[PDB]
């Protein structure tokens, strides 16, 4: 979430990111319930106040809200104890932010995201863009390994595909920012634009990428002015599920049919409907590709036709249980690197060695009944030395 993204930041980047135009307001809206009230209170105070007052300024009931809000805003570093006055820069910017100093667009965003997903899946016809392809490849959801051949889809790719559009886009933009820092694009400048949307060379490239994603559209041969789409700020279902593992989806866009075929066997395709079967073969194929039953169940539930909404639960218990059992049927091997010792002599002496590999992060599996500790070869030169020291101590 955006709260996680902002919490994972340093004070030096935080105060700079608190730009005058929008950031002080976008981060304010994040404040879930009560911290808004305290920010408004001590927006006009130039004198810090004791912490005991803030502690006792919430009744005994519902105090956990007080502690959680205080911790969240301490992490955000909106104020400092100074002994709880707010940061002067944030106070000034917030005062400046508080009395101081379309139908075609949504369709465009939908179509652009749909073609992006078409390219993501193995669609022969899709929009071509080398920058988009390499960005998706380095986002961790795609791997090519051969420039001549079109890139394939990794295991995480299917999971990302089956996610809903809001979370899908949000995670995609999170990965975009994380890779922006890697490629060298300043994070603060690009981040501030997202906040400003909900109200330079790097800016132009970032806006080009956003337009490729379909969140914005200049509409004037790439002019300075832009008109953000609905997705920039941040529908009825069509699938009918039977009790015999049969799906009737009122789908005209090929994207939905492809998504359903990812985990179902298609039987018929009518102009305004398509018939598929959820069989062991298709479900286990999806599970092997990497999906888990939770994504499939959530996808079918969110794309649930209004006819089946009346029944509770919306998705039949037999279908849900069958999908879950099919996914459980498979349990899979793992991969790690390690080295094992033996002849550990005294018992109380083996317990002290277990804490050496656990603190360094090179321990995989321990055994106090046989004395059997696995150590990765990456930290083999540090565990052996410790063992030698212990032997010397005797």
């Amino acid at each position: 979430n955006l709260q996680e993204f902002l919490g994972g930041l340093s004070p030096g980047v935080l105060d700079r990111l608190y730009g005058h135009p929008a950031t002080c307001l976008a981060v304010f809206r994040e404040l879930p319930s009560l911290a808004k009230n305290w920010v408004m209170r001590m927006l006009f105070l130039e004198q810090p106040l004791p912490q005991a007052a803030v502690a006792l300024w919430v009744k005994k009931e519902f105090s956990k809200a007080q502690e959680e809000s205080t911790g969240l805003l301490s992490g955000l570093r909106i104020w400092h104890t100074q002994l709880l006055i707010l940061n002067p820069i944030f106070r000034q910017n917030l005062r400046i932010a508080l009395l101081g100093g379309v139908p075609s667009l949504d369709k465009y965003a939908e179509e652009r995201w749909e073609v992006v997903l078409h390219f993501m899946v193995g669609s022969p016809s899709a929009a071509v863009s080398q920058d988009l392809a390499q960005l998706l490849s380095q986002a961790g959801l795609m791997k090519s390994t051969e420039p001549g051949e079109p890139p394939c889809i990794t295991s995480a790719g299917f999971q990302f595909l089956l996610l809903d559009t809001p979370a899908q886009l949000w995670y995609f933009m999170l990965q975009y920012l994380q890779t922006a820092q890697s490629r060298g694009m300043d994070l603060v400048e690009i981040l501030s634009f997202l906040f400003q949307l909900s109200f330079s060379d790097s800016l132009l490239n970032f806006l080009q990428h956003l337009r490729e994603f379909g969140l914005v559209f200049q509409r004037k041969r790439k002019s300075r002015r832009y008109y953000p789409t609905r997705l920039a700020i941040n529908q009825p279902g069509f699938i009918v599920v039977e009790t015999n593992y049969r799906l009737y989806a009122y789908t005209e866009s090929e994207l939905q049919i492809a998504l359903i075929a990812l985990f179902s066997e298609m039987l018929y395709r009518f102009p305004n409907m398509v018939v598929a079967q959820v069989t062991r073969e298709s479900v286990q194929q999806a599970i092997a590709s990497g999906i888990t039953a939770q994504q499939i169940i959530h996808f079918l539930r969110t794309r649930a036709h209004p006819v089946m909404l009346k029944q509770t639960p919306v998705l039949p218990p037999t279908i849900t249980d069958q999908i879950r059992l099919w996914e459980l049927e498979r349990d899979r091997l793992r991969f790690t690197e390690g080295v094992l010792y033996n002849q550990f002599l005294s018992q109380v002496d083996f317990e002290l060695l277990l804490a050496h590999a656990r603190e360094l992060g090179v321990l995989v599996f321990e055994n106090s009944a046989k004395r059997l500790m696995v150590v990765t070869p990456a930290g083999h030169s540090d565990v052996k030395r410790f063992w030698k020291r212990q032997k010397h101590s005797s």
Partner: protein, 263 residues
């Protein structure tokens, strides 16, 4: 969402008395504080909305239905509209010596029906928790008791909180009014520091008011008096028509003219 309505009692007689006294506090600063409170209320959230009403001896008028200084456009529009309308209203006003007491019941009635209109127009998906932040500034009128009580009971039925912020005077009628609907009652004795009181006591909405420490409510003296000499009475002799609190047993209450039968 929350619909806040600031009922400012801008009584020219009293505020101009302050101006003649040359006191530190002035109606300009009071209007600025109210403006800041409204700006902060809308600052809280986009869905939140506000309105302002000014009271005068004659009538009450609404003060509220780019980035030259790098300002938020909506709050800039609010500042401009309120400033212009308040200056116009204060500058233009007829003189009537007979009527000088400040009018508040009519302003509150306007606020109530405005809140009802907004509640009707707003989509049923989102629930609106309206509030009326009354800011009295002068002594109330005796003749307004009945209508003010009507509007208070209407607010109670319609679930709106009357948060009174009387200053320089303690209106028993207004404290009784807010007590009925459960709205807070704060009597700021430091007029220059009034805005700090708003950003703490009044600004938090009913959602968070319970889970917050605020000044304890003031004891309310629910007095009763007979219609003859206007004095506290603990035992009242009302009839079945007038429903009037009287002095002592009488053959017939004057306000009724009924043919009471002795027994």
């Amino acid at each position: 969402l929350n619909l806040l309505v600031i009922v400012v009692d801008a009584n020219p007689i009293w505020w101009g008395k302050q101006a003649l006294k040359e006191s530190q506090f002035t109606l300009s600063k009071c209007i600025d504080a109210v403006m800041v409170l409204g700006n902060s209320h809308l600052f809280m959230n986009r869905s939140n909305k506000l309105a302002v009403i000014a009271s005068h001896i004659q009538e009450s008028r609404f003060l509220y239905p780019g980035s030259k200084d790098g300002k938020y456009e909506l709050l800039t529009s609010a500042n401009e509209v309120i400033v212009e309308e308040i200056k116009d209203l204060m500058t233009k006003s007829d003189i009537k010596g007979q009527h000088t007491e400040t009018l508040l019941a009519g302003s509150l009635a306007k606020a109530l029906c405005y809140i009802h209109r907004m509640n009707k127009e707003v989509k049923d998906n989102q629930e609106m928790k309206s509030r009326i932040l009354v800011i009295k500034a002068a002594e109330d009128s005796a003749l307004q008791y009945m209508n003010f009580m009507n509007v208070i009971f209407a607010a109670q039925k319609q679930n709106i909180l009357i948060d009174a912020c009387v200053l320089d005077s303690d209106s028993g009628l207004l404290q009784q009014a807010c007590d009925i609907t459960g709205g807070l009652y704060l009597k700021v004795p430091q007029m220059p520091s009034l805005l700090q009181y708003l950003l703490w006591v009044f600004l938090p909405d009913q959602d968070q008011r319970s889970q917050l420490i605020l000044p304890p409510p003031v004891h309310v003296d629910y007095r009763a008096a007979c219609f003859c000499h206007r004095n506290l009475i603990e035992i009242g002799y009302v009839c079945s028509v007038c429903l009037s609190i009287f002095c002592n047993f009488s053959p017939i209450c004057t306000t009724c003219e009924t043919a009471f039968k002795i027994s």
